[PDB]
Amino acid sequence: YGARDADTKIWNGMVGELVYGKADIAIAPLTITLVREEVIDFSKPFMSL
Amino acid sequence: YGARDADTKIWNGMVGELVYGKADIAIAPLTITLVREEVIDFSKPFMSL
Amino acid sequence: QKTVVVTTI
């Protein structure tokens, strides 16, 4: 899904696929967290849990 | 809280104060709706009812 | 216009 690799400071997964390039939208179970919100742009929640 | 009117098109409440001039932030139980989101600028929910 | 590239999992 997405996490900052604390050694290399490089994202991965669906967050890292659109921060770093090759995606325009991420319609997927991407939980709204603070460390993701600083780099990507979430909608309002379509599902609560 | 805030709503339009089909006569004078005027927001009446806490959304009325943000749109026009009379406020800067409206920390309060405003429910994130579509008709408010077009004219004001909400945040990720702090309270899931 | 271009094709928008969804990335699901």
Q: In A, which residues are within 8 Å of C7 by CB distance?
A: 14, 17-18, 23, 25-26, 28
Chain centre to alpha carbon of residue B10: 12
- Among A37, A42, A48, the residue with its CB nearest the CB of B48 is A48
User: Reduced to 3 states, what is the DSSP secondary structure of residue A10?
Assistant: strand
Name the method of structure determination: cryo-EM
DSSP state string for B7-38: TT----SHHHHHHSSS-S---S-----HHHHT
Calpha distance A35→A42 (Å, rounded):
12
If you search the block for the tokens 């742009």, which residue do you land on? A41
Alpha carbons B13 and B22: distance in angstroms, whole number: 11
Residues of C in contact with A1 (CB under 8 A): 9
Helical ranges in A1-49 per DSSP H: 13-19, 34-37
The token pair at A28 is 């997927």
Contact A32 B44 (CB under 8 A): yes
